[PDB]
Design an enzyme around this catalytic site. Structure first.
Site, PDB file in Angstrom:
ATOM      1  CD  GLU A   1      -2.602   1.615   0.159  1.00 26.45           C
ATOM      2  OE1 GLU A   1      -3.087   0.725  -0.566  1.00 26.45           O
ATOM      3  OE2 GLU A   1      -2.751   2.836  -0.059  1.00 26.45           O
ATOM      4  CG  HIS A   2       1.538   3.310   2.738  1.00 20.45           C
ATOM      5  ND1 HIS A   2       0.909   2.667   3.784  1.00 20.45           N
ATOM      6  CD2 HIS A   2       0.702   4.282   2.342  1.00 20.45           C
ATOM      7  CE1 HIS A   2      -0.270   3.234   4.004  1.00 20.45           C
ATOM      8  NE2 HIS A   2      -0.416   4.219   3.140  1.00 20.45           N
TER       9      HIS A   2
END
Ligand SMILES: NC(=O)c1ccc[n+]([C@@H]2O[C@H](COP(=O)([O-])OP(=O)(O)OC[C@H]3O[C@@H](n4cnc5c(N)ncnc54)[C@H](O)[C@@H]3O)[C@@H](O)[C@H]2O)c1
Ligand SMILES: [Zn+2]
Ligand SMILES: [Zn+2]
Lengths: 405, 428
Positions: free
Chosen positions: A300-301
């Site tokens: 996600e990051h």
């Protein structure tokens, strides 16, 4: 070759009743659920006066900080909105076709207002919907201990530009926004993180990661800090390092425990568990191999602390959000969310249209007729025939052998 | 002032599909290509090759005459041309935010798309090429196309020609669930599909849903529809003809007329039976039941009331035969695709397919389905001077000490000879 210098250790009906009840009895049922679940006996929809008085205590410094963080989302979302363009175009001469781009009418935004939640959780959806050009944004958040919405969450909702604010939690919040109770304005979509009933409610009606890519030029103290950063969220917060450098890999695996031990108690426990259970380290041969792994994991990051950052921007293909270089960091906040994704695009619709001159139908009509008759679609061909007769009264084109079967 | 001059005399769902797919996917996961090959034999009686070679493609399309090819080529090009334009409408960019912060959007196609074509008796050839042509226009590098074999010889030659001319990279003679799964798992190719598209029966639908979830059901499925918005200036003979056009698809094809003109409504209601009656037997039978049971005519007061009810019905295919077309384009908000003016018509073919409105607004088959947006950010050291402070103070208010320290570390490295209010550390 790929080497796993560390690997991971570890790896709903109530909704049906509540929704059947809310659907049947409307706002009545929402009030009862509010009192039963949240002990809430007061007004649901906040007035302009209630909002300012409940956020009067929020200091100027705190407001300025939150205002700044919202602007960093808003200002990207504004640019992103313009990236999907309306157009006309001419295909075959005399054929015009195009695309309109509309925001949806109503977005509903939920925020949990629990402990160890980012304030970003409250303003991301609201700020994004508004920048997309949505005219009604409804924001709900569960009331804190019969005192109202957490003042920081309430300030965020307001500063982000929410049009309606409702002190309402869980399944009642999502149902209310979806059926449009209290506002008479059903939400075209509802967004926001919540618990399992919230997620299943959004399913029936409609874990924080971090990865770091690094080479030998990377500073392992920062890398290790960044992994630890999200590790403290919970016991099931993955923290991955993909590297082409054994030295960095080993040095990071040595610092992470030390930084965890230096954390305060609650964060120490969370990160200890998380780094053990879901932490991973992967050494790779080439850059090209790192990509392969990164894209499979699709964090996600994703942070990228390497030389030649352009190459990584160009070659990475699967992630929620990219943090390019050392200077920025996950904690500074993504502008969007990957597929849970959340961006202006989620709140935007394309509509396509076509129009023709009569001259265009001369060819398009007769092709359509012949194809339709080969398909055995005689009525289709006849919509072409009729136009040919009207526009070209004495024409005889090959319109195909009429169907008999 | 809304008035139903003709009402729908029926309603549009059992999931026996769920059973079969769950079983079939379970089986195909276990034994792979052999389970697929065995299903082809049991379901379709097929025993030949699966993956076609360039030789087989030319061999099996050799008896498609030049004139038929040219027509298909033309129809495919119309889709391609719109698709390429539509691809250009989603831009990459970068933007400066807080000074020293750069952020941006990358736009790139998915790697692999699977396209399925039902290729039954009463299907449009467009069903074979629209998926493939759109995927290629989007810049998808690998497009895999499947259609169940027609009559023991292989893929229906018109469908096969369409696949080839549309630009399919791999073609496979597979039907039903076993085609969907093969494309999804990358059986026979070693290239698993990022998305699978194409109309089909309730098994194909369920297989897509099961494998892809939302992006597997978000395209218009179910019987072909047609809506016409018509005012006093519309030609009733053309309107009635356009409705009957899609009603021949089958017994469940809805045809809707929304109009502000009582006069037009009456004339259309009289013409439709006459037109149906003059169709050949198959089509006559299809359209008669289609109109009887699912035909609707709605007389409205103002333009606004037509917009209200059109947006509610959200037809996959919406014709507008009125004055002041600019207004209708500006005020209609829910439909699959729009046919503006009398000249174009549904049978000329939309260049996309709209969303599954009968599940809602998002999705459909266009280049947009086959493209991802990735967002990125990059900062100078100077940018963090302000951003680190804010992050630190906000994080500590959230009780996120580790988060705050990611900023502390940067503040100390980038700005050694400086102090900032980074918030009071967390003790809990
Ligand atoms: N209105 C329209 O525009 C239109 C036109 C044509 C067809 N349709 C719809 O499309 C569908 C076409 O039907 P189709 O059978 O040709 O579908 P299809 O071509 O999508 O799939 C056919 C394959 O399904 C598989 N299959 C069939 N029965 C099965 C079963 N009981 N269990 C497991 N697998 C099975 C077989 O392998 C077969 O080759 C229908 O639902 C029809 O109503 C709609
Ligand atoms: Zn976090
Ligand atoms: Zn049709």
């Amino acid at each position: 070759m790929i080497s796993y210098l560390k690997k991971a250790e570890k790896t709903q009906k109530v909704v049906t009743e509540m929704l059947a009840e809310i659907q049947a009895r409307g706002k009545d049922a929402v009030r009862q659920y509010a009192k039963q679940l949240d002990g809430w006996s007061g007004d649901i929809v906040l007035t302009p006066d209630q909002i300012r008085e409940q956020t009067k205590d929020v200091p100027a410094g705190v407001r300025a900080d939150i205002d700044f963080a919202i602007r960093q989302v808003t200002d990207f979302a504004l640019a992103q909105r313009e990236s999907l363009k309306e157009f006309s175009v001419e295909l075959h001469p005399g054929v015009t076709a195009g695309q309109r781009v509309l925001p949806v009418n109503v977005v509903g935004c939920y925020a949990p207002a629990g402990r160890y939640a980012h304030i970003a959780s409250a303003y991301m959806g609201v700020a994004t919907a508004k920048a997309a050009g949505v005219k009604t944004v409804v924001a709900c958040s569960s009331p804190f201990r019969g005192q109202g919405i957490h003042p920081h969450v309430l300030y965020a909702f307001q500063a982000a530009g929410a049009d309606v604010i409702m002190a309402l939690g869980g399944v009642q919040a999502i149902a209310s926004m979806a059926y449009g109770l209290f506002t008479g304005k059903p939400a075209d979509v509802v967004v926001g993180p919540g618990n399992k009933f919230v997620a299943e409610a959004k399913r029936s009606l409609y874990p924080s990661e971090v990865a770091v890519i690094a080479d030998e030029t990377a500073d392992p103290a920062i890398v290790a800090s960044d992994l630890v950063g999200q590790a403290e969220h919970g016991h099931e917060s993955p923290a991955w390092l993909f590297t082409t450098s054994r030295d960095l890999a080993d040095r990071v695996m040595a610092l992470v425990p030390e930084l965890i031990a230096k954390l305060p108690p609650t964060a120490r426990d969370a990160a200890t568990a998380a780094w053990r259970d879901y932490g991973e380290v992967i050494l790779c041969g080439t850059r090209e191999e790192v990509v392969e792994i990164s894209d499979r994991y699709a964090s996600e990051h994703l942070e990228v602390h390497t030389a030649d950052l352009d190459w990584w921007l160009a070659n990475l293909t699967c992630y929620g959000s990219l943090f390019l270089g050392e200077e920025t960091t996950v904690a500074f906040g993504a502008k969007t969310s990957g597929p849970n994704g959340l961006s202006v695009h989620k709140f935007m619709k394309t509509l396509t249209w076509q129009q023709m001159t009569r001259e265009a139908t001369r060819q398009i009509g007769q092709v359509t007729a012949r194809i339709s008759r080969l398909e055995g679609m005689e009525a289709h061909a006849r919509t072409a025939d009729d136009r040919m007769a009207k526009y070209f009264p004495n024409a005889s084109f090959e319109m195909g052998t009429p169907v008999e079967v």
